[PDB]
Ligand binder design. Structure first.
Ligand code: CDL
Ligand code: PC1
Ligand code: NDP
Ligand code: 8Q1
Ligand code: ADP
Ligand code: SF4
Ligand code: SF4
Ligand code: SF4
Lengths: 51, 118, 198, 338, 441, 172, 53, 98, 161, 56, 49
């Protein structure tokens, strides 16, 4: 319910203001999946000359 | 090839190897070498003031590289820590004293350096 | 120059009202081409470059400026030919050059823009190329170019509460003032400059 | 001899002022400021000192007065050898003396030594050396033979001896000098912070005080050097107005916002305790004795107006040094930003 | 898993209290005296819950007017500024400056090209830079002993530097159209080979504690992710551009190669994820492959075969010849191809030849004359594409010398890739960008 | 407005409110804003000296509005009064009032805004930044001035004063 | 206009609110000069916010 | 609106939010926006309103006066402020007791 | 007299403060790399009991290792003033000593000694790791001897007064 | 593009995961062994000896 | 012995024998760092001198 207060006006904001053309201030947090991070398998793409 | 402390060498006879050509002064990237020369009473071309500002100088070795008579040599001494800033304004006295003290090792290194091209 | 090269004539084909002045030299890479671009069309040309098909994969590698007012041929003066790029340096107050790299064409493209107005006005392109922001900030602060429509005009790599354009040939390397410590003010102060001459 | 001093004051630290000065007793509060006064115009400064501990900031910061190749520090100075003084003042045309008995000293013999013997030897060395154009000895305001304070009692004899040995010596008698590192404003702040409830007074607090700024004192020194006629005369330096101890406390409290509170200890018992117990900077008999005594500018000698220096008022001058120590009461939200 | 977009982002609406900064954000001065900061970065950081929101970098704390001083000084005397620009790629900076000078002159350093120094030592400097970058990144993340482990190899490489030029740092070795052939020695090559063999142990020691660690993977993976479009827009190059998957390497470029790289069979690595973990893996693989490149370079100047006796079919070794001591001969190809030039170089000097003395005097009085013209020469330094744009007016001094440093462009993206991240992820990002402010300023 | 000067960049007056329960407001003109300045777009081009003068007047107005806060934060109020600092900066602007180039005026205004922001955010030191606010010919209010030169050279031309003062060290 | 409720499109453009509602100067400024402010103009709203603070 | 714009709509997709909300660059301004005759902030035209309201309108008389002044003085001398020491007019700092 | 107790306690204090000599984690330019080289195993700084601390409050030595710019001089002064006493200052490199390669620049201060009292100077560009070790050890010996350099005079009973 | 070749970290030794790096290690060790064998067969090493008479 | 410790060369000084180092008549005995001592480098014209 507390988040719904900040959620109220987002619809009108996005509807009336272009998200790309207009410079609108906002804040966000980046999320990572810890299970995927721990299960990730390191790997690289080796590149060599044509043969 | 290690470049440590600037020093001035002498010929085996004791005569100064430095002639006031100012090539080292011109080559010094940091303008750390000041040279003033006046003819000696005997008529030799010798400097009257040869100062190196150790605080303003980058230990590059261009002075020794440009010296045509191996007068100025960056000898291996590196334990030259100073407590007063004035102590790092090396003068002709200081350079000659360093050269006299470190001539053996400097000469030993110069032998190998000269023989390498051969 | 044993490579496959093509001139970047698309810009001048599209912008039909501009004349072409292009160069390539062995002093540069085999795939590097220089061209002259007018300032009043620089912004539109960058707009076209940033979203044209083959120029889409274009990155603004470098940008800077040259104070051409004091440029003089110190040697081989008579060897100068009317086709050399140096002919444009004389009598022009400033020359701002940008350099981009295109991946599709595996090419390097440099654009030279002559600023003759005394105030050094030119439209900024940091709104098209993101990395151009700091490059143009540095160019403006060091050479005094008055970029227009720029995202951020605040100085970058210059001291606080100081106004100067050190990279101009008029300015002296020793500067005009030195920072010392004042005991009366018990803090770092700045006063007139006295230096050492070799 | 000739007391003329040709120096150029229009240059910065890297210029050549034309003054070569030796400043004895520069490790005190006023020493660094006096040294910097001459150093910042390009003058050469020598600081002879035998200070413990050597690594103290007081000794260390003296090197900033002039710069590299212009400021020199002579350590392990011997004050009873004439050769040491001769070496110190060999190449100096100005000799400033600030060697006075410290507020931490109660021994009459030590105070007399510091205020008389060193000053007399410096004056004798200056007389021996014909290149010493100017001598500036720093005395204290209110010096008198009948003064209860041993410091003032010995300083009067010291200035008399300096005048006798070097008739062209200039004697200053500054009042209570205040500043960032002073012994008056800093002492007030530290005492109030250490007690948290009061400042301990030992008298009626009716003694008159005429504070002067250390910057003004340095400007007075520079003006005295500029003026040739100032040689051989005694100057009393002080602020534009005279305040009692109670008035000074009131002014400081009003400026800083800290409510005033003076806790009284009987003068006799305070004197007995301080004279029978160990004395340090914040607990000494000299402060107790000088609390009652008046240290103001008298008309018997030349004043600062003669040196042509306009001292700043104490309320204006001392305000900047108490900005950090300010009472935090009710303040606006905008002021809360800081 | 349910949606969390509303909990993850908070937009700002015009004149709305709820959609606004309802808190007093923390404006911290990250650096300059901050262990994470390299020392000359004053980043005004707007933290809100210890999460970065707004970046205001100030980078002028190490501005020194290097370009102005270079313009004031002649060509040769301005070279050490390029060593000063980068504290870990000084050899590459010198190589770029000399490449520009020789491109202006219209010639190439055949001596260096045939001696292979300008490629093997470039790779050694790349190993130095990668070691320092990975060590600093690990130290910032929290791992301690990696710094000591990498700095041991750094000390070995600096010993090689001092042996070849007498300066363990700021070599100032490369110079245009000249090489100190005397310094190059076979025993130096053998010691470099021993170092290359032993470097695998240090690489494995770091890899065991970093590569597979769960904490390291959770710290780096999916942090600072960016796309090829971001790389293109911000001009990212080197390890970041390869982390973008662009497959952009200037050493293996037909029209942009500058040394023996184009004729060596080595591999460049790119990742399908543009994150710190991929960048770290790429740095490790580049360090490993530098060993192979150095091995190839040294083999290019080696005489493996030997005379075989007809009767016994066994090698005939020279007992009193220098070639028996070692199998690597730096001067082999140079002597074989440019015999006249090598003979002149080793026979004529300033102490016996009037022309040599005149050349030396002029060279050390006023730098070599450079024909007027504009050039732009670039190299693949460990931190990205490092370029020099030089305009010469025909005198002994450069009229203009602009330096395109990849560090500036890499630092430009730091707000972009670290906006929504925490303070730890930001101190991780500053290390992963691999920035040294000497060249930035 | 997404700008450092926007009306939404104010510092909240409470942890749960903006200055009231029935209204929303804050101060951003006489003090620094809540969020730092990430970008300062260049002043829109001025085609007329009228527009250039308007920009100069608005910048000077902002400086006058901000000077008391700057003085309080930098602890330089004793050196000069707020009005004294305003008058000193006005003299500084007067020295440059001869400009007649809109582009140069815009560049100068951008630089002035940048330096004012630095003063607000303490990027500069008080001693370094007080050079603009210092009186041109009046003594600093926190120091005792010396009128020895005026007494010595009273009713004498500036040329004679400079002649007696000198313009080169006399030792060398 | 599709998806904008009562907002309706004029000849030269589409309005930012319902027909009879009042136009907002702050919204107009945000749209036209987004992110750009030559100077901190003290409007009635700004003055009232200062007074309330 | 978020799904129309392209934001993540799943928990596993929440970890690539920055690629859809912040990483994407903003379209550069049209070049026609740089040719506007005037850039003054928009305000309601107070024509037909009371004089009290018009008092809050932008002062066009000041613009006209500035235009007249700049037409009359296209070129002026550079003002120089004397640096010679002068006794302060406000002597309060050196003449105040309390 | 107090000297009987002061002098041995002086020696103990000097020994302790020499053994525990924590510099400040502050590097500005390439000389920071040499400082890290001196910290790392090859020349173990911990052998002489010197451990770097991040905060100036917990630092005994101010290692000015790198160039000082006008834009940074107030910062260096503030760090020096905020470092708790007693403290010493060691300039490292030509740039920190006397401006080094950039002595003729418009941005670089001609020496950190103009802003700070420099206790010791270590010439070099960059100074070697052994050079920095030598400077640190010489500074430690000087620090140990600073407590009593024979200032006070001995009376007829050999007790200092 | 159509036949990607990847390097996969799957063992403690990163050299082992690549056939080329194993060959690099083997070649380095082979070179060291060859040098050692040649020097042992020779039985001694000539060296440059300083001579003070060189400075007559 | 400085070079011998530094491993610049494998030759070391030998007293009373065939040496690898030249012994000129103008050589002076080695001295440790004399800084912070009265016998320190004093520039000509410096205040200390
Ligand atoms: C265990 C066996 C069993 C039997 C029991 C035996 C006894 C058990 C006792 C248990 C309790 C022990 C408590 C003390 C522990 C040790 C610490 C200590 O001694 O204090 C020093 C310690 C020093 O201060 P600090 O905070 O460490 O210093 C910080 C920095 O130095 C300051 O930095 P700064 O920059 O702010 O510097 C400012 C400047 C100072 O700032 C200023 O500039 C302003 C001040 C300058 C003048 C200072 C003069 C001294 C003032 C004394 C204050 C006493 C506090 C009470 C005041 C009451 C007044 C109404 O600083 C100074 O100079 C420092 C102060 C110097 C003090 C020197 C004298 C101390 C020793 C003697 C004290 C005698 C007091 C007796 C009180 C009455 C007792 C009934 O604190 C004190 O000075 C306060 C001590 C007060 C308690 C004394 C207890 C012993 C005497 C009791 C009476 C006799 C015995 C009765 C019982 C008999 C039973 C059989
Ligand atoms: C673990 C060791 C603990 C040591 C604690 C020592 C406590 C103090 C001991 C004082 C001994 C006094 C002996 C007789 C003195 C005779 C001279 C005289 O006139 O007497 C009056 C003396 C002299 O003071 P005065 O000011 O009256 O006179 C000066 C002397 N004349 C006049 C001759 C010039 O004063 C006293 O009241 C006694 C001495 C007080 C000393 C105060 C400083 C002490 C410093 C201690 C340093 C060691 C700290 C150890 C802990 C360190 C932790 C890291
Ligand atoms: N409030 C004030 O400051 C006033 C000062 N004065 C005079 O001005 C002078 C300078 O002022 P200030 O800095 O405040 O005073 P200080 O007490 O701080 O300075 C006195 C100096 O003399 C030295 N000294 C003390 N005793 C001896 C001794 N026996 N032998 C040798 N040197 C000794 C001290 O050195 P060490 O550190 O080694 O003990 C110190 O350097 C004072 O000494 C006094 O004469 C006059 C009126 C007011
Ligand atoms: C906090 C510390 C801040 C310090 C800031 C320092 C940097 C300042 C930057 C430079 C500022 C300038 O010079 S901006 C320079 C602006 N240029 C002009 O003023 C030319 C046109 N002049 C006029 O319109 C009038 O003369 C006018 C004087 C305006 C009014 O006078 P009144 O109608 O008669
Ligand atoms: N000591 C050496 N230094 C340089 N090149 C050498 C040396 N020894 C042999 N070579 C090279 O080896 C080739 C000749 O081979 P080979 O006849 O086996 O050698 P050598 O006759 O000197 O024993 C030439 O290319 C020659 O330059
Ligand atoms: S080492 Fe370089 S900078 Fe130093 S004195 Fe020699 S030539 Fe000059
Ligand atoms: S040191 Fe060498 S280069 Fe310098 S003046 Fe003497 S002889 Fe010439
Ligand atoms: S003195 Fe030399 S090594 Fe040290 S910071 Fe300056 S240029 Fe770099």
């Amino acid at each position: 319910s507390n988040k719904n207060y900040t959620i109220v006006k987002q619809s009108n904001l996005l509807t009336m203001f272009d998200f790309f053309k207009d410079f609108i201030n906002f804040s966000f947090i980046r999320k990572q999946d810890l299970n995927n991070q721990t299960n990730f398998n390191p790997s690289l793409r080796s590149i060599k000359k044509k043969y | 090839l290690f470049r440590g402390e600037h020093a001035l060498r002498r010929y085996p006879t004791g005569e100064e190897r430095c002639i006031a050509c100012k090539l080292c002064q011109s080559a010094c990237p940091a303008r750390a070498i000041t040279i003033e020369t006046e003819p000696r009473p005997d008529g030799s071309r010798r400097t009257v003031r040869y100062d190196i500002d150790m605080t303003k100088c980058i230990y590059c070795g261009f002075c020794q590289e440009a010296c045509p008579v191996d007068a100025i040599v960056e000898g291996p001494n590196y334990e030259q820590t100073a407590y007063l800033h004035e102590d790092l304004f090396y003068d002709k006295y200081k350079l000659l004293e360093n050269g006299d003290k470190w001539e053996p090792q400097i000469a030993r290194n110069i032998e190998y350096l000269i023989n390498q091209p051969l | 120059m044993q490579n496959k090269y093509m001139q970047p004539i698309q810009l001048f084909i599209v912008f039909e009202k501009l004349n072409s002045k292009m160069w390539i030299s062995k002093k540069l890479n085999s795939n590097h081409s220089i061209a002259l671009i007018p300032s009043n069309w620089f912004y539109s040309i960058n707009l076209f470059l940033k979203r044209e098909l083959l120029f889409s994969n274009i990155t603004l590698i470098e940008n800077s400026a040259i104070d051409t007012i004091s440029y003089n041929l110190e040697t081989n003066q008579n060897d100068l030919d009317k086709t050399n790029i140096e002919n444009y340096f004389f009598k022009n107050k400033m020359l701002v050059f940008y350099n981009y790299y295109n991946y599709f064409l595996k090419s390097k493209l440099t654009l030279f823009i002559i600023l003759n107005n005394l105030n050094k006005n030119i439209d900024s392109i940091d709104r098209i190329f993101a990395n151009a922001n700091w490059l143009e900030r540095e160019t403006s602060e060091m050479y005094g170019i008055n970029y227009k429509w720029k995202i951020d005009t605040r100085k970058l790599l210059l001291d606080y509460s100081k106004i100067e354009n050190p990279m101009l040939k008029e300015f002296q390397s020793e500067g005009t003032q030195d920072a010392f410590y004042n005991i009366f003010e018990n803090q770092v102060v700045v006063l007139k400059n006295e230096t050492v001459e070799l | 001899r000739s007391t003329q001093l040709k120096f150029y004051d229009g240059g910065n630290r890297q210029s050549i002022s034309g003054i070569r000065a030796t400043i004895f007793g520069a490790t005190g509060f006023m020493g660094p400021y006096i040294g910097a006064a001459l150093g910042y115009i390009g003058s050469d400064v020598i600081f002879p000192h035998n200070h413990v501990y050597a690594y103290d900031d007081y000794v260390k910061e003296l090197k900033l007065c002039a710069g590299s190749g212009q400021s020199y520090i002579m350590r392990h100075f011997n004050y009873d050898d004439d050769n040491m003084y001769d070496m110190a003042i060999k190449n100096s045309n100005v000799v400033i003396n600030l060697v006075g008995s410290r507020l931490q000293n109660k021994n009459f013999q030590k105070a007399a030594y510091a205020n008389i013997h060193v000053a007399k030897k410096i004056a004798e060395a200056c007389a021996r050396n014909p290149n010493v154009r100017r001598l500036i000895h720093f005395s204290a305001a209110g010096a008198d033979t009948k003064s209860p304070s041993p410091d003032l009692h010995t300083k009067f004899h010291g200035e008399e001896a300096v005048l006798n040995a070097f008739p062209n010596a200039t004697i200053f008698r500054p009042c209570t000098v205040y500043g960032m590192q002073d012994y008056f404003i800093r002492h007030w702040i530290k005492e109030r912070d250490w007690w948290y409830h009061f400042n301990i007074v030992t008298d009626d607090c009716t003694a008159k005080r005429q504070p002067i700024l250390i910057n003004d004192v340095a400007q007075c020194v520079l003006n005295a050097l500029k003026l040739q006629e100032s040689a051989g005369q005694i100057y009393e330096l002080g602020g534009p107005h005279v305040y009692s101890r109670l008035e000074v406390f009131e002014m400081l409290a009003n400026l800083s916002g800290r409510p005033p509170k003076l806790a009284h200890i009987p003068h006799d018992i305070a004197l007995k305790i301080t004279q029978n117990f160990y004395n340090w900077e914040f607990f000494n008999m000299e402060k107790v004795i000088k609390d009652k005594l008046d240290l103001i500018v008298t008309g018997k000698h030349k004043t600062i107006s003669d040196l042509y220096v306009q001292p700043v008022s104490f309320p204006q001058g001392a305000e900047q040094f108490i900005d950090d120590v300010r009472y935090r009461g009710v303040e606006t939200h905008d002021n809360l930003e800081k | 898993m349910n949606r969390s977009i509303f909990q993850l982002w908070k937009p700002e609406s015009p004149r709305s209290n709820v959609n606004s900064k309802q808190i007093k954000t923390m404006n911290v001065n990250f650096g300059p005296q901050h262990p994470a900061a390299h020392g000359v970065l004053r980043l005004i950081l707007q933290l809100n819950g210890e999460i970065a929101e707004r970046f205001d970098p100030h980078i002028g704390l190490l501005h020194r007017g290097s370009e102005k001083l270079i313009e004031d000084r002649p060509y040769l005397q301005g070279m050490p500024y390029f060593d000063r620009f980068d504290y870990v790629s000084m050899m590459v900076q010198e190589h770029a400056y000399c490449l520009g000078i020789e491109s202006l002159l219209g010639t190439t350093n055949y001596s260096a090209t045939f001696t292979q120094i300008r490629t093997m030592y470039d790779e050694l400097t790349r190993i130095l830079n990668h070691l320092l970058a990975v060590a600093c990144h690990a130290l910032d993340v929290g791992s301690m002993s990696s710094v000591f482990w990498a700095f041991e190899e750094r000390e070995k490489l600096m010993e090689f530097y001092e042996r070849v030029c007498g300066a363990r740092m700021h070599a100032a070795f490369y110079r245009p159209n000249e090489v100190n052939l005397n310094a190059v020695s076979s025993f130096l090559m053998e010691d470099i080979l021993e170092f290359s063999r032993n470097f695998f142990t240090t690489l494995n020691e770091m890899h065991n504690v970093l590569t597979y660690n769960k904490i390291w993977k959770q710290r780096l993976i999916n942090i600072g992710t960016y796309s090829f479009q971001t790389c293109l827009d911000y001009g990212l190059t080197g390890v970041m551009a390869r982390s973008c998957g662009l497959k952009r390497d200037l050493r293996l470029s037909k029209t942009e190669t500058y040394a023996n790289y184009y004729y060596l069979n080595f591999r460049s690595y790119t990742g399908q994820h543009g994150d710190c973990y991929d960048r770290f893996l790429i740095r490790m693989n580049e360090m490993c492959e530098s060993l192979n490149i150095v091995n190839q370079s040294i083999n290019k100047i080696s005489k493996f075969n030997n005379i075989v006796s007809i009767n016994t079919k066994k090698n005939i070794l020279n007992k009193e010849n220098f070639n028996r001591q070692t199998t690597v001969l730096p001067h082999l190809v140079l002597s074989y191809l440019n015999k006249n030039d090598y003979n002149l170089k080793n026979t004529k000097n300033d102490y016996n030849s009037m022309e040599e003395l005149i050349t030396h005097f002029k060279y050390w009085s006023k730098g070599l004359k450079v024909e007027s013209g504009y050039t732009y020469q670039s190299v693949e330094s460990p931190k990205g594409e490092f370029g020099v744009s030089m305009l010469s007016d025909g005198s002994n001094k450069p009229y203009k010398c602009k330096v395109r440093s990849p560090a500036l462009h890499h630092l430009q993206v730091l707000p972009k890739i670290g906006k929504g991240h925490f303070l730890a992820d930001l101190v991780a990002l500053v290390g992963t960008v691999d920035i040294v402010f000497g060249e930035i300023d | 407005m997404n700008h450092y000067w926007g009306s939404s960049n104010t510092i909240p007056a409470s942890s749960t409110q903006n200055n009231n329960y029935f209204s929303g407001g804050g101060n951003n003109v006489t003090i620094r804003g809540n969020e730092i300045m990430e970008r300062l777009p260049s002043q829109t081009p001025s085609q007329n000296m009228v527009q250039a003068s308007m920009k100069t007047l608005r910048f000077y107005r902002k400086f006058c509005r901000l000077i008391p806060f700057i003085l309080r934060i930098h602890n330089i109020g004793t050196k000069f009064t707020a009005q004294q600092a305003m008058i000193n900066f006005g003299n500084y602007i007067r020295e440059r009032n001869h400009y007649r180039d809109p582009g140069l005026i815009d560049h100068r205004i951008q630089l002035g805004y940048e330096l004012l922001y630095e003063a607000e955010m303490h990027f500069s030191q008080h001693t370094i930044l007080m050079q603009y606010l210092s009186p041109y010919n009046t003594p600093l209010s926190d120091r005792g001035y010396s009128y020895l030169e005026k007494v010595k050279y009273g009713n004498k031309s500036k040329f004679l004063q400079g002649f007696y003062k000198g313009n080169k060290p006399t030792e060398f | 206009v599709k998806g904008k409720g009562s907002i309706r499109k004029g000849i030269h453009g589409e309005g930012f609110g319902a027909p009879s509602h009042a136009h907002d100067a702050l919204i107009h400024q945000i749209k036209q000069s987004k992110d750009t402010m030559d100077y901190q103009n003290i409007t009635n709203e700004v003055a009232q916010n200062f007074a309330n603070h | 609106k978020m799904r129309d714009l392209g934001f993540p709509m799943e928990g596993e997709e929440e970890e690539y939010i920055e690629q859809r909300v912040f990483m994407r660059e903003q379209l550069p301004p049209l070049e026609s926006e740089f040719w506007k005759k005037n850039y003054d902030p928009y305000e309601q035209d107070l024509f037909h309103f009371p004089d009290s309201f018009k008092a809050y309108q932008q002062q066009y008389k000041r613009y006209d006066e500035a235009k007249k002044y700049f037409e009359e003085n296209p070129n002026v001398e550079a003002t120089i402020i004397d640096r010679e020491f002068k006794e302060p007019t406000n002597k309060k700092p050196w003449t105040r007791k309390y | 007299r107090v000297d009987y107790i002061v002098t041995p306690i002086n020696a103990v204090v000097s020994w302790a403060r020499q053994g525990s000599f924590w510099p400040l984690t502050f590097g500005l330019a390439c000389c920071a790399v040499e400082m890290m080289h001196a910290t790392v195993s090859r020349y173990d700084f911990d052998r002489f009991g010197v451990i770097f601390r991040a905060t100036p409050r917990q630092a005994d030595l101010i290692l000015v290792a790198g160039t000082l710019t006008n834009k940074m001089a107030p910062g260096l002064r503030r760090l020096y003033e905020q470092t708790l006493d007693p403290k010493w200052v060691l300039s490292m490199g030509s740039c920190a000593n006397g401006g080094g390669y950039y002595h003729y620049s418009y941005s670089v201060v001609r020496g950190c000694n103009r802003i700070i009292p420099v206790d010791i100077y270590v010439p070099g560009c960059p100074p070697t790791a052994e050079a920095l070790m030598f400077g640190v050890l010489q500074l430690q010996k000087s620090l140990y001897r600073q407590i009593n350099e024979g200032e006070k005079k001995y009376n007829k009973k050999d007790l200092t007064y | 593009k159509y036949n990607p070749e990847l390097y996969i970290y799957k063992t403690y030794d990163m050299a082992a995961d690549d056939p080329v790096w194993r060959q690099v290690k083997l070649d380095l060790e082979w070179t060291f062994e060859n040098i050692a064998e040649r020097r042992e067969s020779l039985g001694y090493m000539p060296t440059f000896k300083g001579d003070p008479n060189f400075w007559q | 012995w400085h070079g011998w410790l530094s491993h610049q060369y494998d030759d070391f000084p030998t007293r009373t024998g065939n040496s690898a180092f030249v012994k000129h008549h103008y050589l002076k005995q080695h001295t440790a760092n004399l800084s912070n001592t009265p016998l320190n480098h004093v520039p000509q014209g410096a205040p200390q001198n």
